[PDB]
């Protein structure tokens, strides 16, 4: 209603949403594409220099390090731990395809979860080894 | 465009009025005129509840 929440959360000034960040940290293709990339002319660090968590290009390699050691980073790293929230949750909570929601939670518990964690380990290795 | 008042259109419309398009109305008047008669007879029975 008032001015702050308006001029952060307009439709124009929208961040990437956590579902798609979870799906880009899920598998080692979509990590390593975002880690490599081409040289873009537009984007801050001529591409490059990109936290996958906070979907955010930096200028320098140094101003990544200072980002990574910070509560603004650790904010999102907590938010991406659990099941990432989709329509299946808010449907199931009414009482409407539980079994698809339970089969999703089973696969995220068993198959996808430790895969996407074991990617984040390789991010923690890759970023700190490069920097 | 043609106006509301255009002679061609109002001469066209008057051919429609007469045919299928008044028959709808003159059925509906006969449907209501029944219900107005059947509305009385209820109230004439409601009198006969007291006349008993």
């Amino acid at each position: 209603m008032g001015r702050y929440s308006v001029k952060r959360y307009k439709t124009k000034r929208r961040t990437r949403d956590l579902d798609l960040i979870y799906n880009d940290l899920s598998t080692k293709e979509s990590v390593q594409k975002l880690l490599n990339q081409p040289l873009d002319e537009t984007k801050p660090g001529l591409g490059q220099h990109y936290c996958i968590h906070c979907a955010k290009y930096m200028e320098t390699a140094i101003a990544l390090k200072t980002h990574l050691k910070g509560k603004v980073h650790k904010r999102r790293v907590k938010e991406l731990r659990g099941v990432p929230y989709t329509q299946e949750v808010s449907d199931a909570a009414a009482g409407y395809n539980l079994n698809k929601f339970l089969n999703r939670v089973q696969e995220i518990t068993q198959s996808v979860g430790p895969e996407k964690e074991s990617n984040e380990a390789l991010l923690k290795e890759h970023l700190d080894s490069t920097l | 465009a043609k106006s509301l008042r255009a002679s061609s259109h109002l001469n066209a419309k008057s051919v429609k009025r007469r045919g299928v398009f008044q028959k709808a109305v003159d059925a509906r008047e006969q449907r209501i005129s029944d219900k107005l008669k059947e509305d009385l007879l209820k109230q004439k029975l409601e009198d006969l509840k007291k006349k008993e």
């Binding site: - | 009025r17 209501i32 005129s33 509305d39």
Partner: protein, 386 residues
């Protein structure tokens, strides 16, 4: 000069002068003709409209892009408790106007009509058609002579009625009067009808049905003294202009040396008698016939009335008319519903409508649950219940 940029004016010169009406009750100005042949029929019913709600349907409009495809819309509910007939006036036609020359009354009349005729009920001895019915004793004779007059002369017959405001959730005790025209044939049939209907009552079905282009009049929503800018729709002068930005800047010229009747000024807004015409009846419900808000499609046994009632208004316990769009007027008024003035199969006024879901969610907030059963079920057991 010559303006140099042509542009339409602001506001209609037809609707003028833009003043307050004479009565919380727009008077009808015209009735349909008189096809001297048809069965006798009331031409207009008066109710109290008191609602607004949201109806979907599917719209079997052959041609349109929404054919065989479900549409949502807004519909207003006019509550319409049955009308009762208590006078007839005969108008003779003249080289001057139409003159009325005979009102006849129904022997006994309700407390309601009496209260109409009185400005201070809480004192008056209530002494009205007492002396009238006093005359009306003996073969009644005098009344028969006056009915005879009407039969003989007269070229329209108008029926006087009133309402049963004592049945509306509304609190004003005092009922209205009106006049309504009978359209069927001969003075004789008309007047005989009115006689064999004195003191009786006329429901809402027996003046209407589904699918019918009916037009409403009323005196309609006041906003008091208003500005030139939001009375005519004029522009606003740029910013921090001397002597105000909400006005017409230039109002005149060296000739004529007069402000003109056409230059959009400040004054009253709303409380005018308007006619809006061609509104389609959708659903005519009966205060007995429970499960109104239901449908052949819904079956979910529930009344039109929404949760916590309508707003500023009760609960619709009688013949209600639904319409579509918006009658002029605000909740609790009195809209008189005139039928058609003319055959009108603009092929719109023809498609037999079928409603697929009537909305009965709360209006005093954000709607979420139709029936309180729904609400409770969803929430589950709460605190003090159990």
């Amino acid at each position: 000069s010559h303006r140099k940029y042509e542009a339409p004016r602001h506001g209609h010169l037809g609707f003028l002068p833009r003043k307050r009406a004479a009565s919380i009750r727009a008077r009808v100005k015209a009735f349909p003709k008189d096809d001297r042949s048809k069965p006798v029929a009331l031409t207009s019913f008066l109710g109290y409209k008191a609602g607004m709600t949201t109806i979907v349907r599917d719209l079997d409009r052959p041609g349109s892009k929404f054919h065989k495809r479900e549409v949502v819309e807004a519909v207003t509910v006019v509550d319409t408790p049955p009308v009762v007939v208590v006078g007839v006036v005969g108008y003779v036609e003249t080289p001057r106007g139409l003159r009325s020359l005979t009102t006849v009354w129904a022997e006994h009349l309700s407390d309601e009509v009496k209260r109409r005729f009185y400005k201070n009920w809480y004192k008056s001895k209530k002494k009205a058609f007492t002396k009238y019915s006093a005359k009306y004793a003996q073969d009644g004779a005098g009344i028969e002579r006056e009915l005879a007059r009407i039969k003989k002369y007269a070229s329209v017959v108008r029926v006087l009625v009133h309402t049963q405001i004592r049945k509306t959730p509304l609190a004003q005790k005092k009922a209205h009067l009106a006049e309504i025209q009978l359209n069927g044939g001969s003075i004789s049939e008309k007047v005989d009808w009115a006689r064999e209907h004195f003191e009786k009552t006329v429901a809402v079905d027996s003046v209407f049905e589904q699918n019918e282009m009916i037009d409403a009049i009323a005196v309609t929503k006041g906003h008091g003294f208003e500005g030139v800018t939001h009375r005519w729709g004029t522009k606003k002068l740029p910013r921090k202009t001397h002597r105000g930005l909400r006005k017409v800047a230039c109002i005149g010229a060296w000739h004529p040396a007069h402000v003109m009747w056409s230059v959009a000024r400040a004054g009253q807004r709303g409380y005018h008698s308007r006619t809006s015409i061609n509104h389609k009846i959708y659903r005519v419900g009966k205060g007995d016939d429970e499960a109104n808000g239901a449908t052949s499609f819904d079956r979910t046994k529930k009344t039109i009335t929404p949760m916590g009632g309508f707003v500023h208004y009760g609960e619709i316990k009688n013949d209600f008319i639904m319409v579509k769009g918006c009658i002029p007027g605000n909740r609790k008024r009195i809209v008189t519903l005139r039928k058609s003035l003319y055959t009108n199969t603009s092929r719109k006024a023809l498609e037999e409508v079928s409603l697929k879901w009537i909305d009965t969610a709360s209006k005093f907030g954000k709607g979420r649950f139709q029936t309180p059963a729904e609400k409770h079920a969803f929430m589950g057991t709460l605190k003090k219940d159990l």
